Amino acid sequence: GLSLAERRLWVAQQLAPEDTSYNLLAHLRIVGATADAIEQALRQLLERHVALRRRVETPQPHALAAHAVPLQRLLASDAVHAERLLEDGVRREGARVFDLAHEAPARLLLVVTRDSARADLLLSVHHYAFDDVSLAVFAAELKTLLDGGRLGVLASTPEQVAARERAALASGRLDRVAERWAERLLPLARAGQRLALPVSAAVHAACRALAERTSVSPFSAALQAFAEVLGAELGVDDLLVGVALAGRSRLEMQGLVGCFVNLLPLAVGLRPEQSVEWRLRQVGHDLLELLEHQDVPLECVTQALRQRGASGLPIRIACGAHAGVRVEADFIPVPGARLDLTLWLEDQGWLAVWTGVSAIFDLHRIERLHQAWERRLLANA
Ligand SMILES: CCCCCCCCC(=O)N(C)C[C@H](O)[C@@H](O)[C@H](O)[C@H](O)CO
């Protein structure tokens, strides 16, 4: 069977079969390897990571052979021609509808430049079989094989992860955590614009000093100012904020390729009664609680809320944080905006990636929102 992390994306795809916003596109840039070596290493990674080569019967996964994953190889006359071939592949793979019932969820395009040590790999994979950490695992093991190294035995599989979850659900310990959370969250129960903006050095240092003298993670300070600015504009004293989590709750899950991401809600109180340092401590603690219980699926919290008389949980805002052969891997952002507004922090200083629904945000309003967020952080510190 599929895990609930895999199922929620597979189900959402079945609800809108022509929606391509679950297609993940990863561009890998490789320097110092031959085309034959890259193709050979890629086939080993496909055999190693079964999630990249399964089909789904209407929902039961079934493994396919590694040679059944399409891999196209093209020779570019020069570096600019290689750019045009990748851009063509980006547009084509972004529009492709995956046949998840009969074909592997992954496709590969290897572009080699003549008289050059640079190759270019475009990996398109449906989101039910991939996530952000999977790309880092994939890119790291690619460089390992291209360097001549060896890979260790995998500790688990997506099927084992789904099995352990089936047990933890029947044991009821996941629902008991969700039922506790449902108490705190009960009162609260498209075209998009994306803009990446650097976090200023002063805001970076203020966020660290505020986090050190308060004994919380700097992300907690960033999440607090994030919730405070939006809650002030919204006119509410309580703000529901989803937190994107890697969902890899054990050591055996840290090296798997597949879909394990989870979205869990927390509530930020915006009462002027509480101090700034105390609201930060409450946010940092609730954040650590979500990280400690990453394996509690979102459907359990929804189940617990519907048991208390609510129709569901309307999450509108969310946030998250991201020698030898040279390998760089970067996702190409998915267009659209399922949620009204998300903030993602990535490392280099840090980089703030804002995605807002176009009905509320244009690019200029996003820049103003980023500045208000930086000011709130400097003020909070
Ligand atoms: C799902 C989220 C829904 C709520 C969205 C809240 C957007 C907040 C925002 O835009 N700022 C804080 C930037 C600036 O400080 C403001 O003065 C704008 O100019 C003002 O809103 C006019 O555009």
Numbering used by the authors: 822, 824 to 880, 885 to 1015, 1031 to 1163, 1173 to 1198, 1201 to 1233
Quoted passage from the original study:
Non-ribosomal peptide synthetases (NRPS) are multi-modular/domain enzymes that catalyze the synthesis of bioactive peptides. A crucial step in the process is peptide elongation accomplished by the condensation (C) domain with the aid of a peptidyl carrier or thiolation (T) domain. Here, we examined condensation reaction carried out by NRPS AmbB involved in biosynthesis of l-2-amino-4-methoxy-trans-3-butenoic acid (AMB) in P. aeruginosa. We determined crystal structures of the truncated T–C bidomain of AmbB in three forms, the apo enzyme with disordered T domain, the holo form with serine linked phosphopantetheine (Ppant) and a holo form with substrate (l-alanine) loaded onto Ppant.
Crystal structure of the apo form of AmbB T-C (residues 727–1249) was determined at a resolution of 2.4 Å. There is one molecule per asymmetric unit. The structure revealed a typical V-shaped condensation domain consisting of two subdomains, namely an N-terminal lobe (Gly824–Ser997) and a C-terminal lobe (Gly998–Ala1233) subdomains. The active site of the C domain is at the central groove formed by the two subdomains and has a conserved HHxxxD motif in a loop between strand β6 and helix α4. There was no visible electron density for the T domain. This is likely due to inherent flexibility of the T domain as well as the absence of the cofactor, phosphopantetheine (Ppant). Residues constituting the loop region in the C domain, Gly881–Gly884, Lys1016–Arg1030, Asn1165–Asp1172 and Pro1198–Glu1200 are disordered and not built into the structure. A detergent molecule from the crystallization condition, MEGA-9 is bound to the peripheral side of the C terminal subdomain between helix α8 and helix α11. Such a binding mode far away from the active site is likely to be a crystallization artefact with no functional role. The C domain of apo and holo AmbB T–C show a quasi-identical conformation suggesting that it does not undergo obvious conformation change upon Ppant binding, at least by its upstream T domain.
